[PDB]
Amino acid sequence: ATFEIVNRCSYTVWAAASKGDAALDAGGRQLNSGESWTINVEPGTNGGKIWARTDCYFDDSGSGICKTGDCGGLLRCKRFGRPPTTLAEFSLNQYGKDYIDISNIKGFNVPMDFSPTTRGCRGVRCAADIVGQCPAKLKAPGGGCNDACTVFQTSEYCCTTGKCGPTEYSRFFKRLCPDAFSYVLDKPTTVTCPGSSNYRVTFCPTA
């Protein structure tokens, strides 16, 4: 599958692509404003994620640190990133279908559109100014807006035991971005696409 990752933000972002135990394609790339990166994602990739990282620096060996979304200090991500991270999530060729979503469960850093570039299903977007509107306790010191699980680390917010429900914090993300997951047990906003679709992830999508 082809994924085009496009940075339309005014700021640089360091794109990342991983399935949690390995990079997808090169795993990461610096994208200055307006740049894109086209990757190949293998068919059958399950539990893949693409995200932006902000305010990074790396040395010539590709080791360094990002203020949002850092993946073990690497340019070329092998593992998922540190919150806060707006997440484009996908599982491909799953019993004949692809499944895509955007999630704020791990917070929000950069606005995102995640759309097919082939026919037959909708895209989703979360492009409200969540960072500017972020409630005080969720503001991350390095920038972006943490989820309440990362901040409070209890099942009330993490949905590890019993049956978690919405909180004022989850409702904040949901109100700003109805089409993204706001907590683990949110009513799903996943889109079912034809198997073997192609996609575009756009940071700071055009309104």
Swiss-Prot record:
Gene Ontology annotations for the cellular component aspect, listed alphabetically: cytoplasmic vesicle
Subcellular location: Cytoplasmic vesicle
Keyword Nucleotide-binding recorded: no
One Pfam family cited in the UniProt record for this chain: Thaumatin
Disulfide bonds: C9-C204, C56-C66, C71-C77, C121-C193, C126-C177, C134-C145, C149-C158, C159-C164
Major localisation: cytoplasm
InterPro entries linked: Osmotin/thaumatin-like_sf (IPR037176), Thaumatin (IPR001938), Thaumatin_CS (IPR017949)
Keywords: Cytoplasmic vesicle, Disulfide bond, Signal, Taste-modifying protein
Keyword Signal on entry: yes
Function: Taste-modifying protein; intensely sweet-tasting. It is 100000 times sweeter than sucrose on a molar basis.
Family membership: Belongs to the thaumatin family.
Name this polypeptide is given: Thaumatin I
Lineage summary: Eukaryota, Viridiplantae, Streptophyta, Embryophyta, Tracheophyta
